[PDB]
């Protein structure tokens, strides 16, 4: 029921917690690497080395579950109290696009790291659990390997009007 | 299968009431110094572990005297003194290099300028960190900051002979110094008090000395010339 | 035994509490330390014969706190500053000729005497 | 230099301050800070003994004039933009001002 | 204690030395072959030779000091560790004979490089069992591997080419 997060990702998550909460810095919402893009890249890379058709099928359906759950989950348990203003602004700006096409790996990894406590309430079969968790492990490894391209480099300071708007 | 896992996840999320994010307790209690807050915020856990600031401190709880570190005075030549919450030092709020206008808040620990953590790049240690003793005697790349404490006759003289000798020696040095200086009077006067009218000479009758030419460089840098000819010695006009 | 590589080695040791307290301080200059004596080498209900066989009844962060010797740190700073000091004295030798740069309040500025002179 | 360091041990009788001095030296050796910050922050440690301080300036090869030039700028580490200003995102850096000109 | 793995190291022993080690072990456990005690040259001589052969190439007093201390530590370490994990039960009695006969001659001086390559191959486990830092590990391992290369160069002289069969009294006194 536990995961193996690399120490670089732990450090990055704590640094992002601090930057967003205490230092009043946000992330540019339209990302150059998309969530869908990274999902597709990892999917292609793993299928290109997978072995049998049963594994192909389970991996495909796992990735599908991942993307649909992201799109259904982002705006409910993935943002801090300092980002809801930005979230509603982005929804007003692009009301036709979707979150899987809007946000990035900076939040995909929040989803990944938080998955254990969610599978804590969920109680499906241990086989499915272990498949999904191994897939999440390999995904975290792939991200921390390709750090240079997927992750943002500098955060952005929120403007005074934004801060007066949020105020929380 | 994992399709059913996805179904159960969707059912849970659309059944429950949204909340704000908090990374797991493992990641949170990983590092040293970090800690949650009242509304899920990030607050460093280095505050005053004891709990308006007492402006003048004279006596310490250990009897050690309270003298400023830089000027060695006693919190009475200036109406306030500050106590470092990391070492056994006291500083005047006026002796620090940028002098502090107001004393800091009695909530947050204050750190004197005699610590190395002011110019280290911040880092984070995990809260299971065995202090390693590096044996490499020389040439150890150490990221500048993570080196912890560098761990490794009774005479009964009873005489004032040396004290008397030292006092007389001090008086003799003083006597010689005073003699030399008070002979070089009557020339200190001429070369330091008429020094304001010889510059007037080498300005009026424009004789090029190093300082005149430096002043002209100063005036050119004020006027911000580019490529035209320098006008003359007395006609650059920030008059 | 019959193996093609068997890339290891084996040798029978005696009781490992003196050997593993030195291999720590090998590259180090701080001499080894000892511990409480009567717990070091006892029988523990094992009386042994002469043969001494078995007696039957991806990136990573900068994460640690190091302990360094003050001797090496001092000796390193003396050598670190010696090289930097010689490099500064090497560039301290200044001999340049120009006309119309303002550069510094440097050593060789009889230059300014030149552009101001022909007019005056 | 050995004399310099035993005299430093004599002057800084508190082992905590002595260790902080050594840590500053280590920072310099590794290259996180430079000679300017080294001397400008060692002054706060060694000022009480003119012999120690002149010896340190002789070690660093810094004339007193240059030390006085570098002190005020290389003692306290503040951001270049000041402690109260901060940069803006590129988005809100071009809000309309219908009366401005190029000048 | 970090990200679960941190990879163990390896000394790139030359294949010739690998074959030598395996054949030596086999001949000493099955063919009752023994080592000519003492030897010529000795461990101290070999260490001094490597020192004089590699010292003239360093270009910094930092490297000079660390290398000097490393080689001297290897001397004292072979002194302290020879009689623990560097023999077998067979020649244990030969070690007993030399130990009781030669009163106070240094064991580093008595033995030769044939018992030095064994410590050079066993160093990874000893580094692993203890808690040193990465730079010290890398330094010691690099010096050990260049030592092994120097030994491969000077093989013809540093490695005696024959052994001797155990005498009857010796094999009876050892039993095995
Ligand atoms: Zn003061
Ligand atoms: Zn302090």
Swiss-Prot record, chain B:
Name the coiled-coil region(s).
none
Q: Where are the zinc fingers (PHD-type)?
A: 65-118
Name this polypeptide is given: Uncharacterized protein C2F7.07c
Report the source organism. Answer: Schizosaccharomyces pombe (strain 972 / ATCC 24843)
Provide the taxonomic classification: Eukaryota, Fungi, Dikarya, Ascomycota, Taphrinomycotina
Tell me the stretch of the parent sequence this chain holds. 333 to 599 of 607
Swiss-Prot record, chain C:
Q: Which Gene Ontology terms cover its molecular function?
A: zinc ion binding
Q: Which keywords are on file for this protein?
A: Metal-binding, Phosphoprotein, Zinc, Zinc-finger
Top-level taxon of origin: Eukaryota
Q: Name one GO biological process term.
A: regulation of transcription by RNA polymerase II
**Cellular compartments per GO CC:** cytosol; nucleus; Rpd3S complex
- Spell out the protein name for this chain: Uncharacterized protein C16C9.05
UniProtKB/Swiss-Prot annotation, chain D:
Where is each PAH domain found? 1-63
Q: Cellular location of this protein?
A: Nucleus
Q: What does this chain do?
A: Has a role in chromatin assembly and chromosome segregation. Involved in the deacetylation of histones.
Q: Which domain of life is it from?
A: Eukaryota
The portion of the full protein included here is 257 to 359 of 1075
Q: What is this protein called?
A: Paired amphipathic helix protein pst2
Gene name as annotated: pst2
Q: What organism, scientifically named, is this protein from?
A: Schizosaccharomyces pombe (strain 972 / ATCC 24843)
Self-association state and partner proteins as the record states: Heterotetramer of alp13, clr6, prw1 and pst2.
Curated annotation (Swiss-Prot), chain E:
Query: A single GO BP annotation from the record?
Result: DNA repair
GO terms under cellular component: NuA4 histone acetyltransferase complex; nucleus; Rpd3S complex
List the subcellular locations.
Answer: Nucleus
Describe the location of the MRG domain by residue ranges. 5-175
Q: Does the keyword DNA damage apply?
A: yes
Q: Which domain of life is it from?
A: Eukaryota
Assigned keywords, A-Z: Chromatin regulator, DNA damage, DNA repair, Nucleus, Transcription, Transcription regulation
Ranges annotated as spanning the membrane: none
- What does the record give as the function of this protein? Component of the NuA4 histone acetyltransferase complex which is involved in transcriptional activation of selected genes principally by acetylation of nucleosomal histone H4 and H2A. The NuA4 complex is also involved in DNA repair. Also involved in deacetylation of histones, chromatin assembly and chromosome segregation. May act as a transcriptional oscillator, directing histone deacetylases to specific chromosomal domains.
Subunit annotation: Component of the NuA4 histone acetyltransferase complex. Heterotetramer of alp13, clr6, prw1 and pst2.
> Which family, according to UniProt?
Belongs to the MRG family.
- Record-given protein name: Chromatin modification-related protein eaf3
Full protein stretch here:
162 to 337 of 337
């Amino acid at each position: 029921h536990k995961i193996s997060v690399p120490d670089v990702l732990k450090l990055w998550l704590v640094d992002d917690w601090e930057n967003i909460t205490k230092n009043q810095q946000l992330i540019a919402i339209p990302r150059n690497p998309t969530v869908r893009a990274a999902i597709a890249a990892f999917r292609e890379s793993k299928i290109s080395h997978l072995n049998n058709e049963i594994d192909v099928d389970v991996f495909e359906q796992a990735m599908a579950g991942l993307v649909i759950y992201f799109n259904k989950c982002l705006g409910n348990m993935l943002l801090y109290r300092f980002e809801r203003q930005q979230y509603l602004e982005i929804r007003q700006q692009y009301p036709d696009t979707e979150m899987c096409d809007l946000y990035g790996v900076e939040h995909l990894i929040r989803l990944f790291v938080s998955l254990p406590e969610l599978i804590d309430r969920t109680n499906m079969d241990s086989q499915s659990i272990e498949c999904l968790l191994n897939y999440i492990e390999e995904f975290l490894k792939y991200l921390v390997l390709h750090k240079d391209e997927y992750f943002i480099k500098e955060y952005q300071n929120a403007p005074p009007n934004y801060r007066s708007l949020v105020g929380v | 299968t994992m399709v059913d896992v996805w179904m159960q996840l969707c059912t849970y999320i659309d059944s429950h009431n949204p909340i704000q994010f908090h990374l797991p307790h493992s990641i949170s209690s990983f590092f040293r110094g970090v800690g949650s807050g009242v509304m899920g915020e990030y607050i460093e856990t280095d505050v005053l572990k004891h709990l308006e600031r007492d402006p003048l401190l004279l006596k310490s709880k250990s009897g050690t005297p309270i003298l400023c570190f830089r000027c060695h005075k006693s919190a009475l030549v200036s109406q306030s003194i500050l106590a470092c919450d990391y070492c056994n030092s006291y500083w005047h709020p006026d002796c620090l290099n940028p002098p502090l206008a107001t004393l800091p808040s009695n909530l947050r620990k204050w750190k004197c300028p005699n610590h190395s953590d002011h110019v280290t790049p911040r880092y984070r240690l995990p809260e299971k960190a065995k202090v390693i003793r590096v044996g490499l005697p020389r040439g150890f790349k150490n990221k500048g900051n993570i080196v912890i404490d560098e761990n490794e006759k009774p005479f009964k003289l009873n005489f004032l002979e040396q004290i008397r000798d030292n006092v007389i020696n001090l008086r003799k040095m003083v006597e010689q110094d005073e003699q030399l200086c008070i002979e070089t009077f009557s020339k200190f006067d001429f070369y330091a008090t008429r020094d304001c009218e010889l510059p007037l000479r080498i300005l009026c009758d424009v004789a090029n000395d190093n300082l005149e030419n430096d002043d002209y460089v100063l005036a050119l840098r004020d006027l911000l010339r580019i490529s035209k000819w320098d006008p003359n010695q007395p006609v650059p006009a920030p008059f | 035994f019959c193996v093609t590589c068997s890339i290891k080695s084996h040798h029978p040791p005696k009781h490992p509490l003196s050997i593993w307290s030195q291999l720590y301080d090998w590259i180090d200059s701080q001499n080894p330390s000892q511990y409480r004596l009567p717990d070091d080498l006892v029988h523990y209900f094992h009386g042994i014969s002469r043969g001494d066989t078995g007696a039957y009844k991806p990136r990573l962060p900068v994460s640690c706190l190091y302990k360094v010797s003050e001797d090496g740190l001092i000796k390193d700073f003396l050598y670190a500053i010696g090289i930097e000091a010689k490099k500064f004295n090497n560039e301290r030798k200044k001999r340049e000729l120009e006309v119309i740069p303002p550069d510094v309040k440097s050593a060789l500025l009889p230059a300014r005497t030149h552009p101001n002179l022909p007019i005056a | 230099s050995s004399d310099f360091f035993k005299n430093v041990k004599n002057v800084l009788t508190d082992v905590e301050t002595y260790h902080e001095f050594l840590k500053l030296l280590n920072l310099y050796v590794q290259g996180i800070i430079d000679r300017n910050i080294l001397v400008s922050r060692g002054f706060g440690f060694l000022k009480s003994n003119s012999g120690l301080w002149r010896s340190f300036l002789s070690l660093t090869s810094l004339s007193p004039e240059e030390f006085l030039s570098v002190y005020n700028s290389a003692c306290s580490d503040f951001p270049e933009c000041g402690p109260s200003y901060r940069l803006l995102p590129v988005e809100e850096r071009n809000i309309s001002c219908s009366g401005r000109d190029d000048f």
